[PDB]
Amino acid sequence: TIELSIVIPMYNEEDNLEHLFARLLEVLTPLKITYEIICVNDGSKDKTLKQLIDCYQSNRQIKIVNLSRNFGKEIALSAGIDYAQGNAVIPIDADLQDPPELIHELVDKWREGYDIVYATRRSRQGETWVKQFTAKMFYKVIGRMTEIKIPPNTGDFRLMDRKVVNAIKQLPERTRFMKGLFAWVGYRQTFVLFDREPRFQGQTKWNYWKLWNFALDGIFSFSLLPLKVWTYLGSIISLLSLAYASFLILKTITLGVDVPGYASLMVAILFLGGVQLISLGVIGEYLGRVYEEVKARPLYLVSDLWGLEYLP
Amino acid sequence: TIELSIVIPMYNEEDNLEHLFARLLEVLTPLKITYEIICVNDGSKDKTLKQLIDCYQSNRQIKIVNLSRNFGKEIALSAGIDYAQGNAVIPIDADLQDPPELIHELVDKWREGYDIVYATRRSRQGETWVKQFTAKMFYKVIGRMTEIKIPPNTGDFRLMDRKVVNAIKQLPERTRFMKGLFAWVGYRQTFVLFDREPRFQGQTKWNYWKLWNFALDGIFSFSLLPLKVWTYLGSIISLLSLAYASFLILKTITLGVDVPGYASLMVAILFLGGVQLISLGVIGEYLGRVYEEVKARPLYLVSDLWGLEYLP
Amino acid sequence: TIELSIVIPMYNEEDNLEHLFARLLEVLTPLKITYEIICVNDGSKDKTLKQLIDCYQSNRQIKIVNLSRNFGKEIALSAGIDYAQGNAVIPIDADLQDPPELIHELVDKWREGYDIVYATRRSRQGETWVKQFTAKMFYKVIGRMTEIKIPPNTGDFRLMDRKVVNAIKQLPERTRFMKGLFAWVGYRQTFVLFDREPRFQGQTKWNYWKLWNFALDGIFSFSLLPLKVWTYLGSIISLLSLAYASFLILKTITLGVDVPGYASLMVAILFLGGVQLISLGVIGEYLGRVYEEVKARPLYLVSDLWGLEYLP
Amino acid sequence: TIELSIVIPMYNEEDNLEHLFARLLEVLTPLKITYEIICVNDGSKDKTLKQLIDCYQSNRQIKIVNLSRNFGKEIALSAGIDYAQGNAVIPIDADLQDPPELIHELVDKWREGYDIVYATRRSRQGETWVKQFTAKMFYKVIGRMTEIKIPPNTGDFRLMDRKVVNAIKQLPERTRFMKGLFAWVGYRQTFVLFDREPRFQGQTKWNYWKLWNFALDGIFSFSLLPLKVWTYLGSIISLLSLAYASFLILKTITLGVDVPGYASLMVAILFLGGVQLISLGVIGEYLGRVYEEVKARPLYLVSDLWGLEYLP
Ligand SMILES: O=c1ccn([C@@H]2O[C@H](COP(=O)(O)OP(=O)(O)O[C@H]3O[C@H](CO)[C@@H](O)[C@H](O)[C@H]3O)[C@@H](O)[C@H]2O)c(=O)[nH]1
Ligand SMILES: O=c1ccn([C@@H]2O[C@H](COP(=O)(O)OP(=O)(O)O[C@H]3O[C@H](CO)[C@@H](O)[C@H](O)[C@H]3O)[C@@H](O)[C@H]2O)c(=O)[nH]1
Ligand SMILES: O=c1ccn([C@@H]2O[C@H](COP(=O)(O)OP(=O)(O)O[C@H]3O[C@H](CO)[C@@H](O)[C@H](O)[C@H]3O)[C@@H](O)[C@H]2O)c(=O)[nH]1
Ligand SMILES: O=c1ccn([C@@H]2O[C@H](COP(=O)(O)OP(=O)(O)O[C@H]3O[C@H](CO)[C@@H](O)[C@H](O)[C@H]3O)[C@@H](O)[C@H]2O)c(=O)[nH]1
Ligand SMILES: [Mg+2]
């Protein structure tokens, strides 16, 4: 059997494989447990699949999942986790930004009785106080969308129990906010604090288009809260628009409002706008219902059973 | 085999387990049938799981379903019923607000030939007029929503035959209105009147946000009637607007209306509003069809078969 | 092996069972083939079930499908079709409105090489002008909806081969229009003309709610053509508003408009209406895509195979 | 084991069976590989099926898939590919517009390692400049929507390896734009240039309705990019409308200048339009998420594996 699985999504990672595998060998041999390394080649346009083949031939603990195309880090991680067989699964980057030694600490927490063990940075320490603030506000927003309070500063480096992996695969989903989904599958969760290596500091171009795309997926692909905040703002600006339209009709009828000579335009505008806003609100509520239905999340998740066998 | 399955959703229920189990045993032993008790620990932060494990170790009829986190009473009950194997499932509350002595009565009615035996309070006896009038109107609205007339004053205390349990498990809906769903499975149903124990009161704080969210969920996640009343009234409004626009157009050509000099903003407003209202109505009708399809409700439900074997 | 299945939906059909079964046996005995009679009791409040059980005890060819609730004649017919194992299934009415003797003719047509053999009335007879006009208009609409030209004056009385029954069972859509579904799955189809009995030619009641809902289902639950005639008429209007909004912009920036200075109100009205109509068109197009995706109809329907085995 | 499958969709293709079936055997037999011809009779209202059955009796390699009605070229190709068991599936047209000798070249490129070998026309040639420009613009628009740039001037003549065929069958879409699906699943693709048959160029009168429907299927049934682009565009228009409404409120409050005395109409119009556009944008974003969920494409596609077995 396999106790630990290390999932490494790789995309154009030559000359990083030797160092990464040396570090993983330094880390995983003291553990004295059976492990495996699932390398997800995410359709690289670079001579790295050949080096992965060379490493796999000599080393019996390397398994390779070669994706047909380039799907992205999250999808490659999902593929590796689907193909992982260990009792615990640890996603790890191929650039060694997250130190592999923390695996041991993570594994220790896994033996303490926890199911998901996140690996959180002590602090950002390299962002220009704009990314820190935006991340803090966004994380408060999603935490108010969630009900598990996913720890801040958590990346993809973590440890999953087999129960959590099975629960994640139990969620049939195509638009997945992975942090929100992890919060949704609420098992015994914890985190361990680690400091990223000082060389690995702020050097990435935080292109705000993909950051905004990630924000939109987090806001919309996870929860209906942005859809329920609207259609509640709407039908308030619609009930308040049908009002002051009935009020306008009453004022015109009683006072005899013909100061312009044309006051039915405002009444028509307000009435049609309010009716259309109510229609859009009803459509939004039923679209949220359809979204919940098509997400097809399980009603519940059983963590343990005493005296009962697991339902298939 | 198991004849009866008592499903108790439990959340922070320590110091209530001893009394509840004593009453359950005192009620179930005279029945002289092979019963089972399934306790669904709904992610309690309290120390009830240890006591549940101890009682499962002592009593062999106790079974524990440990949900990953807190999913709510409804989802905990669904999880317990899914794991219930008895010929009749009785959902009960661990607070003993529903007297377990009624179970015998329910079973008696279940042996009379009925499939669903609800437990209904005779009178509210403790709730003010603001929680009686609203309840009454909500029940009339729901009764007009369905075609089976769910008896009023009904809680989760009930008896469900294995036929009804399998019928309910055949609904894969994620947005569930339990009262409407149980009305929808139109088996042979009846009620048993009982008086709630005067130990607890009806002055419980009404979190009207919750009593509005649940009401709107039952209204919106059960039937399409709110979406059918609109896109009908809305389409009627659109037809009236277009008729008024045509009449105004005529009154502009014949009779030569030029008194304001701009009696065409009204025409454009009315025409565009009517066109958008028809578009919204068509979108709403098709969204309703999409919702009915994604709910994936079975077309029919076979109660009994003579000369035939049940389809897979 | 069963050669013929006769599916009879029943609802308060007591006192017709004796005559119906007598006529059915008189018709079916000369055919000299094995047959079954599936009586689908649609949750009748009458004593129909007792007589059905007695007949099933007396006659071995009678099977009963007792639906739990009153689902409707269409859903009862569906429940009968799924539970019918004959090589050719004939839906018929328990009131003997359609003469059972036509079974013989249908069988001959089925043995000529046809897959669906409709039973069409020669004329409406009873109804004179209004019902015929409305039916002709509706049938023209639904004929332009599909591409297989279902014969007119058709009811639920027909013969369907096992191939057609399986093809229909390959459509797991809850919002179903059977008159259109039997055309969409088009096989070798034909019809036979039958003259309804003089008994069943009296004045008929037509509540314009069941008929109205039938028309709405035939319009919106069959295809996207009602949604595709709009999103074009709603988009031509949007284009014709954005144009002439540009024309008013030009007629204001050239030939400086001091004629009611508070013009360009119409520019805003037209521009916002056109943008909203383009939005409504885009949402309508994608909603139709979602609708036909959710319906999950098979892409094709193989009728015969030479040199190949049928796909599982 | 069949090393090559030739799928031929057919509709009213008589007087073309002998020529096609002579050229196909003139081409395939020199390859000395076990081939298989699968003729999908797409509901021809013609004697095509009888001659196909004659050829099926005559030759052991021709198999027939008969569809219940006329479904179209793409659906017939899907049916033929689903019934093809060869290691490489080569769709082909029965009118022989694309030379069958190119199959040899295709097979060579299949032996060279490539998974999808497109057969692309060298140039459109005969058709006019405006048609070529429209096709080029459409392909340029699609290229951004895709992930791997599909070769220009592609058709239904191609070679798909068994890997790619299994990947495409894994896509349970009902709204399939195949030219985009073959780029989404993108394996090791390549293309082979060829010229269409002489005298078979300048006789195609384009069906503007059919071309429009195909283009709209490509735009709307493949990607959400048009939806997201228009949602963004509506968001900018809504923000501009709200900002201009606020500016008008200022100008009518600050500076106190109300010139007409009836300019609240524009504020109401702008504000209601902006609110409705925000609501429509939210509805569109959630409809796109529902569309992505409903399409149910697999997150990833595995091409090769090392050390692991393929998941079921
Ligand atoms: O399409 C893919 C598929 C897989 N991986 C793998 O993902 C791991 C780490 O991904 P990476 O993007 O390098 O994360 P960081 O090293 O922390 O830096 C990132 O910092 C930003 C935060 O997401 C990203 O936008 C930048 O692309 C990237 O420099 C590595 O093993 C990669 O091989 C990718 O990066 N892109
Ligand atoms: O999130 C959960 C999960 C499980 N249970 C179980 O449900 C049973 C009883 O449910 P309870 O909520 O106490 O029923 P009520 O007696 O009707 O009291 C509640 O009824 C209201 C309507 O739900 C609630 O809003 C209030 O918390 C409370 O007054 C108990 O075994 C609990 O353990 C809960 O109550 N809440
Ligand atoms: O809810 C149900 C369930 C089953 N059946 C069975 O369906 C069979 C035939 O139905 P029936 O209503 O008797 O046929 P019609 O004589 O055509 O009655 C119709 O006559 C009108 C036009 O002729 C229609 O518009 C109405 O739907 C309906 O009243 C009968 O054996 C019934 O038992 C019903 O009628 N209603
Ligand atoms: O309903 C059907 C079913 C099957 N096939 C088969 O599809 C193959 C190729 O189709 P075909 O019509 O012969 O292609 P073209 O001769 O190129 O004609 C097309 O030329 C344009 C460029 O593709 C298209 O836009 C037009 O729709 C169409 O007239 C043929 O073997 C047919 O048998 C059809 O054409 N129509
Ligand atoms: Mg309680």
Ligand SMILES: [Mg+2]
């Ligand atoms: Mg009748």
Ligand SMILES: [Mg+2]
């Ligand atoms: Mg041609």
